[PDB]
């Protein structure tokens, strides 16, 4: 019989293909955050949009309503965990206020570029794919990992990376130089 | 057989699917006549055993008014409530009117009270007049086709009058 494991679309295709202002804006966003495809923007956009929809539904419901207080607080707490909303804000209209650069700012590649390590957004993206990064206690190669607030304090190098001091350099060149030196001497 | 494949309440001809199920049954009908006791075992659904009497003659007959029973040979079938065919053919069915040999009852009464429990309810003259001539009108109550024996009661009073009038204006 068919498998019971679920699956879902991450993203929604954009409608109205060639709308100039939107198109140029998307390119501009790619320019800043180093994403490969319009698809990466669209998944992030879809994710934001779902949050906005949920918050919108919640804000229609009346104050002091039991479901509303519970779900709204829970969603907002999840936003705090994500690092989308600051401490001072705590109200659903700041959830509505969430905005697409603010969300991109919480990508792991962005966080690395800001913290250092790499010298470029693009450099950070390749560095993450080539397995040099670590969130502390766990290693990751996915540049679309999003950073939670309690994990922003432990970005590091991977301990099995060259920069971690593992196998220390290029095997080829170092061996060739050592063999030549031994032969020569 | 049972419960479908006949017309809709509207008068419509309802369609059929669902080929006949065993639990419908509709088992073949049994006559049963007057002769020498002969009975066949039937195996009904869920291992319910039933008894098919195909011939009988000797029943359990009750005088209701005194609440007592004696076993008696049944002389003849004389009237049936439904079709005339069953009585003509000499076949028994539940509500049928037979005649019983009254000597057991007569004997019982003479032994118990004297003269030809809740004592002395005083017979009835019409019934008594029948009683002298020694063969008395009775209604079978049990179901021969189910129970393998035919058991009944002596007719009385108003019921007696009704059956006598119908049975025998008069042709």
């Amino acid at each position: 019989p068919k498998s019971y494991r679920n699956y879902s679309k991450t993203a929604r295709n954009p409608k109205r293909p060639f709308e100039k202002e939107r198109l140029d804006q998307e390119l501009k966003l790619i320019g800043e955050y180093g994403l490969k495809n319009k698809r990466e923007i669209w998944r992030v956009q879809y994710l934001l949009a779902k949050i906005r929809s949920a918050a919108r539904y919640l804000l229609t419901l009346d104050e002091k309503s039991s479901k509303r207080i519970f779900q709204g607080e829970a969603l907002l707490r999840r936003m705090v965990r994500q690092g989308l909303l600051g401490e001072n804000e705590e109200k659903l209209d700041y959830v509505l206020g969430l905005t697409l650069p603010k969300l991109l700012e919480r990508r792991l590649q962005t966080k690395v570029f800001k913290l250092g390590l790499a010298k470029s957004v693009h450099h950070a993206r390749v560095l993450i794919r080539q397995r040099h990064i670590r969130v502390g206690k766990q290693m990751v190669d996915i540049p679309s990992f999003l950073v939670r607030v309690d994990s922003e304090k432990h970005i590091d190098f991977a301990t099995t990376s060259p920069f971690g001091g593992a196998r220390p350099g290029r095997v080829k060149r170092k061996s060739l130089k050592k063999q030549k030196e031994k032969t020569e001497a | 057989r049972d419960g479908r494949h006949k017309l809709r309440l509207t008068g419509g001809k309802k369609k059929i699917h669902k080929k006949k199920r065993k639990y419908e049954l509709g088992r073949p009908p049994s006559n049963t006549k007057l002769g020498s006791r002969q009975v066949h075992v039937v195996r009904g659904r869920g291992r319910n055993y039933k008894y098919r009497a195909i011939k009988l003659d000797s029943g359990s007959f009750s005088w209701p008014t005194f609440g007592i029973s004696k076993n008696t040979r049944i002389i003849d079938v004389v009237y049936n409530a439904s079709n005339n065919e069953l009585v003509r053919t000499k076949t028994l069915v539940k509500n049928c009117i037979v005649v019983i040999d009254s000597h057991p009852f007569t004997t019982w009464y003479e032994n118990t009270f004297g003269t030809t429990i809740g004592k002395s309810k005083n017979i009835d003259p019409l019934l008594l007049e029948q009683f002298k001539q020694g063969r008395v009108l009775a209604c079978i109550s049990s179901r021969p086709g189910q129970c393998g024996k035919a058991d009944g009661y002596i007719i009385e009073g108003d019921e007696l009058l009704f059956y006598k009038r119908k049975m025998d204006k008069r042709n």
Binding site: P1, Y4, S66, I69, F70 | -
Partner: protein, 257 residues
């Protein structure tokens, strides 16, 4: 043909079995026995999926062959045998006694019980029949037949029952001051005091139940289990004592540890 159905799909099995989506395809189907299918657990689930003394059905079979499990004072032998709404599970190797109870979310937990209280159980009577020679007998939700019951005990009264003799020690009236436990309704797995009885001709009868936090809910008479008299519950209740937190508070409590 068109016989009885002996299989049970894992998805189609009750939610309160608490089985996963991806673990094979068929559940244990409970054998016929002293409690209804939808209102029990099969012994396999109890041993493997709840207690975790087996990782496989096979290990359950190995455990069961050994006469070290006893339910209701007697050894059991079939894997698919029902645990029952109120009973005593005794695991003889490690000397452990469990009484089976509902939590406050709607599923069965095996609850650690002392040796002394382990020798009795609580039986709801469902019916009382008059059998030959004018001798009454009561009929329990525990599937068990009770000879020579008091005429003072009626249909919704529960009864405390020994496990050595199978005879009655005492009984708890269904009087409107008695502790009641909810067995299968929407609000299953709660305890309250019985506020009020409403009797409806030809139809379902509803009873209003009050919580220890003074919250009120109603429930259908069919699924109401008397559990003590106003002094105390007559068996030891599990951790949350039949009292249900409301969701907001529950989540607030969970965080605040």
């Amino acid at each position: 043909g068109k016989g009885i159905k002996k299989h049970l799909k894992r998805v189609n099995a009750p939610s309160h079995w608490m089985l996963n989506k991806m673990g094979g395809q068929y559940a244990p189907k409970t054998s016929s026995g002293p409690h209804k299918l939808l209102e029990s657990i099969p012994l396999v689930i109890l041993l493997r999926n709840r207690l975790k003394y087996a990782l496989t059905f096979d290990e359950v079979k190995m455990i069961l062959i050994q006469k070290i499990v006893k339910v209701d004072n007697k050894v059991r032998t079939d894997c698919t045998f029902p645990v029952g709404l109120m009973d005593v599970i005794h695991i003889t190797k490690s000397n452990e006694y469990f009484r089976l109870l509902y939590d406050i979310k709607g599923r069965f937990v095996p609850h650690r019980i002392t040796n002394e209280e382990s020798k009795y159980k609580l039986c709801k009577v469902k019916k009382i029949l008059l059998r030959k020679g004018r001798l009454s007998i009561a009929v329990t939700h525990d599937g068990r037949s009770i000879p020579y019951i008091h005429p003072d005990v009626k249909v919704n009264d529960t009864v405390r029952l020994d496990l050595e003799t199978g005879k009655v020690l005492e009984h708890l009236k269904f009087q409107v001051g008695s502790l009641v436990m909810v067995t299968a309704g929407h609000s299953v797995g709660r305890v309250g005091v019985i506020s009020s009885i409403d009797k409806n001709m030809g139809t379902y009868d509803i009873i209003h139940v009050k919580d220890s936090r003074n919250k009120v809910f109603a429930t259908r008479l069919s699924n109401v289990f008397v559990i003590g008299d106003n002094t105390k519950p007559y068996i030891s209740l599990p951790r949350e004592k039949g009292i249900k937190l409301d969701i907001i508070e529950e989540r607030r409590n969970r965080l605040k540890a």
